[PDB]
Amino acid sequence: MACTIQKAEALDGAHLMQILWYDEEESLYPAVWLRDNCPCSDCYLDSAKARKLLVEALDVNIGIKGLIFDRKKVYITWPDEHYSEFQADWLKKRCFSKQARAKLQRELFFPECQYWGSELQLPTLDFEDVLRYDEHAYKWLSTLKKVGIVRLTGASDKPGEVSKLGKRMGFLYLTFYGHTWQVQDKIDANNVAYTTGKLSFHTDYPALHHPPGVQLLHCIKQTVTGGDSEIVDGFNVCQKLKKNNPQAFQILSSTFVDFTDIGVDYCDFSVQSKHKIIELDDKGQVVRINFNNATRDTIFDVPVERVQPFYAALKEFVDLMNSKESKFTFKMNPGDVITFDNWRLLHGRRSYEAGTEISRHLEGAYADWDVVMSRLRILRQRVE
Amino acid sequence: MACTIQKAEALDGAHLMQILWYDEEESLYPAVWLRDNCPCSDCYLDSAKARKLLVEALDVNIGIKGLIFDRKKVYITWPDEHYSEFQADWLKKRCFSKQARAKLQRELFFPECQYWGSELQLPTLDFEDVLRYDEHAYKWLSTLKKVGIVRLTGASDKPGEVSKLGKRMGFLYLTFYGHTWQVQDKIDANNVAYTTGKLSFHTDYPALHHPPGVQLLHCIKQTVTGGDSEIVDGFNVCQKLKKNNPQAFQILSSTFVDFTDIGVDYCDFSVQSKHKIIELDDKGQVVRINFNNATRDTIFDVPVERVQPFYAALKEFVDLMNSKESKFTFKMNPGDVITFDNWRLLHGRRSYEAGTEISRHLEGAYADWDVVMSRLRILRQRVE
Ligand SMILES: C[N+](C)(CCF)CCCC(=O)O
Ligand SMILES: C[N+](C)(CCF)CCCC(=O)O
Ligand SMILES: O=C(O)CNC(=O)C(=O)O
Ligand SMILES: O=C(O)CNC(=O)C(=O)O
Ligand SMILES: NCCCCCCN
């Protein structure tokens, strides 16, 4: 009834096609869009699922010349004699109504988020299960997307585990710190992460214009002298800030802050970026946080009168993150792997004590959100 | 005279430090910024060139308690008894005046562009020279940034050459099409690039939310039956469009277009993105073009009434790109490598004839602009 065609016709100077379905709903389709998306072998490369049709071949004033239909298909002739057939279900899916468009967007991009504070039930799955089973791997990635974090238990206490997850996702995101990297105390540390010091809430790699979307951290060795993990849901914190201190929100969401990283690791590097700490989309919704206090530059490209209020704003924000209602704290054990959204969460670590031997060792890696969402979409298809 | 201190004092409730230099210029430095950027070993990790100071340790209302200076340094005490020393040249570089801030930004980010049309003198260098010599590699990357394209001659007619340039830059950008990929006609092509068809002007990989910044294409085998390259300077074209058709510019710079890519190559993939074809920064300047007509989705997330004007806009834009005043066309030979800005240029290829043997073969790869700018900054330091 919903995907079955009752009538199809050309309207509005033949610049529109109207489909009345057997459920009584009507859908409208611009003629130029139909022509642009002709699935015939001249216009569309089936092996690539891509358009061969050039913009140059498209008449933007085109009208439908003839049309006939049955219950499952419309058949169209165009003024230049080109001929196009479209399937009902294909058309219905791509319906231009607000409701149909949003439904499809939700399927494509899994936009739903569950905001949290200190009440977090840390989502947990088994590691080998996620490797072995599509049902678990699906639960893993969809929860990662929705919640911002998933902990995997029962991995080895050995290097190479995050690599396995990278292969499971697809591939990891190479940076100047390697394909994977070792978080432990280091002589002549090129990075504050590689010392025993406390790391306050940050996101990783704001020194890059495209920070890692997803972070993986696997505990190989844990100290008893400290080293507790802390996380916070940045989207939740931003929402509170806008409510509590609109002016601090406005400043943090509009001021470009310079980040830097000069050193040698996988390779030699001199990295510089500008980011707004609270990054908004065009509708004003928070879509990324860009903030590591370690790598924030001494260079600060703002007029003198904006400097102190920026700091007063940053301070309110950090104070919100440290609030007992926002942060969740936990201690990783050897065999634990945490995988999280490095665009949304901020994460941190308590100080611990240095020794002559390595008391504490994590292995980490990153992955791009597009690579992760790809595996997510494929995994959903296999399980449903 | 310019970097030598004549006087230093605390002003404005000690919330500001003023430095009068021996050239008579004055510079102003917020107290909170001085404290935030104390270079002492408690506040700053020298091996990492990073801030250890936490936002939590920072009093945003702080004032300078005491100050003394000589010609090369200021020495500051803070109300909590912390103590800070700063160097004159360091301070002067980071001066908050509009002129000083922009000077430093230009050094960091090489913002200058030379716009072009059909008059292009295609910048050309030798390949082995760029590998062997920092002076040439510097000329390579700075010209890439400024002009948007550089052609390297005298490479081999063999796979593996783009890899060498990736190592010279630092590393290449892994995608679903491999670390490097082979552009040639392919049975069951997963991509229109892998056929003999014409490719109209496009940027590569808009299906990703972070498209490759830099593209490398190396000609191993060339056909005489066609295969000419075409390029266009997208920033230049956008500028003309805004002038000629503001409404088309407005539409293309505000409408989110969906891109897609489903297939198997390096790995299996289902990729989806949304981008504005003309992407602007917060000051309205064009910073990226996101447009491949092949991978533009059949899905189009706009209200029915916006569809046809979008197409009329896209059409004006493509027509501008094809104008004999904008495009530059050339034919690559075996041994040629083109390296360009895939955020600014659009590129294309003329059709050629299929055969039983491979008549035409390119090898390509990508790299991130941050990885490229890093090598650029380091190269400038070594040559100057
Ligand atoms: C974990 N680290 C040290 C190496 C992987 F990149 C990065 C720290 C985050 C940062 O430098 O922003
Ligand atoms: C050159 N290609 C086929 C493979 C490297 F990614 C990509 C074409 C550009 C696109 O699919 O957008
Ligand atoms: O060591 C930890 O627990 C946390 N480490 C980091 O957040 C890091 O290295 O960026
Ligand atoms: O084959 C060519 O000359 C150009 N190829 C491409 O632009 C591509 O593969 O994306
Ligand atoms: N069953 C309808 C088939 C229509 C084919 C038309 C060919 N021009």
Ligand SMILES: NCCCCCCN
């Ligand atoms: N030459 C000036 C040195 C100042 C040192 C001050 C230590 N509190």
Ligand SMILES: [Zn+2]
């Ligand atoms: Zn067709």
Ligand SMILES: [Zn+2]
């Ligand atoms: Zn971190």
Ligand SMILES: [Zn+2]
């Ligand atoms: Zn200090």
Ligand SMILES: [Zn+2]
């Ligand atoms: Zn291309």
